[PDB]
Design a protein around this ligand. Structure first.
Ligand SMILES: Cc1nc(NC(=O)N2CCC[C@H]2C(N)=O)sc1-c1ccnc(C(C)(C)C(F)(F)F)c1
Length: 855
């Protein structure tokens, strides 16, 4: 009717292509995916609408809290006998008069326990605490130290500004929104293990094979990246008539193919491959493909080594002009189905010590997921299946020991997975990579993922959990139903879940899968769809604004380029879309009225856009009066977000161990095709600008801005904020540390800025470390700059598996740095976990003393 036709237009605006364009898809899987089996996401809507409007407040404004309630030991010493001073504001007045209160509370006070003391001070479930200057609310019962804002105040010794609002005022801001089902929501066999035959797949011809010496098709059965059998060749034929009509015979027995087994295609010319394509041998209904099939082949491999592409996308190229290879897979005069779990469980049951072996299990468990496991070690893990259960973290290595060529082994391993003890979520994430493709294995991780991930940990790893959706071979699966439910229960999760999918829409390998996912999110996200629509039109206004600035690239600032930006932002169509919404880079920051005098274009080779937005809050001055965000268009920001996510994980590990590393990872998001946003850090200047364009001017600026008892802190933190970025630069192999890539805050805290590429491709810093000494090396303060570095990598080395699992997931992301696992070998190269950290230290000095010529 009218409302359904109305709703379907902004949904197509928020995703970029119409909803009706999904109705013309002929694929039964796509239409079946959109049907009511996936619209059970109404359970998310029913959950968030259950205890309205409190549940709608929790959904719209989810708490930004910490994973661990317990405060670090060194941070607990920053308090005053377990007390934190907070300023409580109660504003009841005609227009703008504000009342200020100061409280003496514990650091772990309940958010509604602050009200009791604040009201008691005023009067020597009615109010809520909002952070002054942003839309952050203390709605959930969590310790104040657990909340990110108050803990960050203890991080830097800042003053926590919290103000009082009546809960009825926030509730009135959340009108009820209901979920309505769409039009398309209305609406024996033969086992695979009973047919005694070998796998036999016919190659007929290539419709539009890319050729301009002979052409042959290279095929192989794969389960992840390992070969499920010997690859089978095809007779070479002339390029003019690539007609093959050959029934290739595979050494793999038909009642031996695993559920996730798939056939990989490769048209090769003599031996350079021409095109690649993977075909799932089964379907989402557990049906082995039969009859004639047509597949359009993807473009020339993936810049990889071997001919086939075992890991990738299982499907036909959306472009119909791509080389199309038609195949006649099977003909058994019946419908052949992969057996149910009950048959498999009985099949496995039918078939069925304190030596160094128990100590060898621990050694294999602690090894990193790139140390190749030898066959004798793989056979070693085979015979200790009943003992590998005692060590839950051996499961990733056990799943590579089992051979998927054998029906009895895979059936035996299935019974292990169901009774396998739950593991840590960080380890369970590796089970969702390109390897480990078995649906029971792939679904085991999700069950532990949904039980042990917190909302903030999910927020840190959300960029990783999205990228592993592509490693799933079907549109409907256990992982997406976990991710979709999370996005429709938390606005903060849903905000970044939406923007991460939408950023990956220009990629036709995932546009079909992500487009269906976005539609299921946009249909049930509630009133946030119009907020998201405002952000989408605000960003797409800037995307065309930056693109039209790229037309006049050869121009200077304070000129045609600068005057075009000034005049084009005063236009009511431009200006209305560019205010009164929530910042894409932070859902709690309202990008209100613009400041045309405070928005400019940087005079750099990229020319990004400095954009300044007022803070429309009655108490905006208590945090910040303006939002500064860098909108740049032309360079990919996916590498930047990954590196900045490593920094956050790196500093969190160091902080929890009593190492007061105080590095600052600035906000970063990717919103489209190499388009993104950067959270500006104010009160910070590039070193290249500090030295106006001598090797002592850097220390002078820090000295005159910190005079008296505060001079030590500008030096105490400068050493700690420079040590953390030298280790992080070398561990991650980040590029040249240009003077323009580094900025230092007013109070000595410095950080690195141009990140991106990594793992490959008399200093004014030192005089500051020695507190202005001419020879820093001989000074005592230099030993603190080195002893703290030495105590640091042990935290990274003890937690190197996390930095490996999180890197194994971006292979299917299109980022050139992480094409293969060989690019993650740099992590174990610069950390050396196979060695001992008694001897891994010596490798670190030999690298710092070679580039810096001693020290
Ligand atoms: C996180 C961050 N904070 C900044 N702060 C200021 O620029 N400030 C802070 C106040 C004065 C002003 C200045 N020019 O001194 S810049 C910045 C940043 C982050 C990432 N890339 C960049 C650039 C400039 C290299 C790029 F590529 F975007 F153009 C900048």
């Amino acid at each position: 009717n009218r409302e359904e036709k109305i709703l379907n237009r902004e949904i197509g605006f928020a995703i970029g292509m119409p909803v009706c364009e999904f109705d013309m898809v002929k694929d039964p899987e796509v239409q079946d995916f959109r049907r009511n089996i996936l619209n059970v996401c109404k359970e998310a809507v029913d959950l968030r609408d259950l205890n309205s409007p409190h549940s709608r407040a929790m959904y719209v404004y989810p708490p930004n809290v910490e994973s661990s309630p317990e405060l670090p030991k060194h941070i607990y010493n920053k308090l005053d006998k377990g007390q934190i001073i907070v300023v409580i504001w109660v504003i009841v007045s005609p227009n703008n008069d504000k009342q200020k209160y100061t409280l003496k509370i514990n650091h772990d006070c309940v958010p509604e326990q602050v009200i009791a003391e604040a009201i008691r001070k005023k009067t020597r479930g009615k109010y809520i605490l909002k952070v002054c200057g942003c839309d952050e609310y203390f709605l959930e019962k969590y310790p104040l130290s657990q909340y990110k804002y108050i803990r960050s105040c203890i991080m830097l010794g800042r003053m926590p500004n919290l103000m009082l609002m009546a809960k009825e005022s926030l509730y009135s801001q959340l009108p009820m929104d209901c979920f309505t089902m769409p039009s398309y929501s209305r609406r024996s066999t033969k086992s695979l293990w009973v047919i005694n035959s070998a796998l036999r797949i016919k190659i007929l011809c290539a419709t539009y094979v890319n050729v301009n010496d002979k052409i042959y098709v290279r095929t192989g059965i794969y389960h992840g990246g390992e070969p499920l059998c010997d690859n089978v060749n095809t007779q070479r034929v002339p390029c003019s008539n690539p007609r093959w009509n050959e029934w290739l015979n595979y050494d793999i027995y038909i009642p031996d193919l695993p559920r996730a087994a798939r056939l990989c295609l490769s048209i090769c010319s003599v031996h350079c491959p021409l095109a690649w394509g993977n075909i799932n041998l089964f379907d989402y209904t557990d049906t082995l493909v039969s009859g004639k099939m047509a597949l359009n082949l993807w473009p020339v491999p993936h810049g990889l080594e071997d001919l086939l592409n075992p890991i990738g996308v299982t499907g036909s190229n959306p472009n119909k002009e791509t080389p199309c290879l038609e195949l006649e897979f099977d003909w058994f005069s019946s419908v052949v189905k992969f057996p149910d779990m009950s048959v498999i469980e009985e099949h496995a049951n039918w078939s069925v010590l304190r030596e160094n072996d128990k100590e060898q299990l621990k050694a294999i468990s602690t090894r990193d997921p790139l140390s190749k496991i030898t066959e004798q070690e793989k056979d070693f893990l085979w015979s200790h299946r009943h003992y590998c259960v005692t060590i839950p973290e051996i499961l990733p290595k056990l799943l590579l020991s089992v051979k998927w060529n054998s029906r009895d082994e895979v059936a035996q391993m299935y019974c292990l997975v169901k009774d396998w003890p739950p593991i840590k979520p960080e380890q369970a994430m590796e089970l969702l990579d390109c390897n480990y493709p078995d649906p029971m294995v792939r679904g085991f991780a999700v069950r532990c993922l949904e039980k042990y991930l917190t909302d903030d940990k999910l927020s840190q790893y959300l960029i990783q959990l999205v990228q592993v959706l592509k490693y799933e071979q079907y549109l409907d699966n256990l992982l997406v139903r976990f991710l979709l439910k999370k996005a429709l229960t938390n606005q903060r999760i849903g905000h970044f879940f939406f923007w991460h999918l939408k950023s990956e829409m220009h990629n036709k390998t995932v546009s079909q899968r992500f487009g269906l996912l976005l539609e299921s999110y946009c249909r049930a996200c509630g009133m946030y769809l119009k907020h998201l629509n405002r952000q989408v039109e605000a960003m797409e206004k800037l995307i065309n604004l930056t693109d039209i600035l790229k037309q006049e690239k050869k121009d200077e600032t304070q000129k045609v380029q600068m005057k075009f930006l000034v005049e084009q932002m005063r236009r009511p169509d431009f200006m209305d879309a560019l205010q009164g919404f929530l910042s894409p880079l932070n859902p709690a920051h309202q990008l209100g009225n613009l400041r045309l005098e405070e928005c400019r274009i940087m005079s750099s080779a990229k020319r990004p856009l400095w954009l300044n937005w007022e803070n429309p809050d009655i108490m905006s001055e208590l945090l910040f009066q303006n939002n500064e965000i860098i909108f740049k268009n032309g360079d990919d920001l996916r590498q930047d977000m990954l590196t900045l996510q490593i920094i956050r994980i790196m500093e969190n590990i160091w902080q929890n161990q009593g190492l007061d590393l105080r590095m600052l990872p600035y906000g970063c998001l990717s919103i489209g095709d190499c388009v993104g946003l950067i959270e500006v850090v104010r009160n910070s200047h590039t070193i290249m600008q500090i030295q106006c364009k001598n090797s002592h001017t850097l220390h002078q600026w820090l000295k005159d801005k910190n005079k008296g008892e505060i001079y030590d802190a500008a030096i105490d933190l400068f050493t700690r904020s420079c040590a953390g970025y030298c280790v992080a630069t070398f561990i991650l192999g980040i590029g040249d540390r240009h003077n323009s890539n580094i900025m230092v805050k007013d109070d000595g805290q410095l950080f690195h800025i141009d990140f991106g590429h990594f793992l490959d491709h008399t200093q004014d810093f030192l005089i500051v470390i020695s507190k202005g000494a001419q020879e820093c090396t001989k000074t005592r303060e230099f030993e603190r700059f080195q002893e703290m570095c030495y105590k640091a990598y042990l935290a990274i080395r003890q937690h190197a598996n996390l930095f490996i699992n999180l890197f194994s997931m971006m292979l299917g992301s299109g980022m050139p740095e992480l094409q293969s696992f060989d690019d993650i070998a740099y992590i174990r190269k610069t950390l050396a976990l196979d060695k001992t950290e008694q001897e891994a230290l010596e490798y670190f000095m030999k690298q710092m003393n070679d580039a810096h010529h001693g020290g």
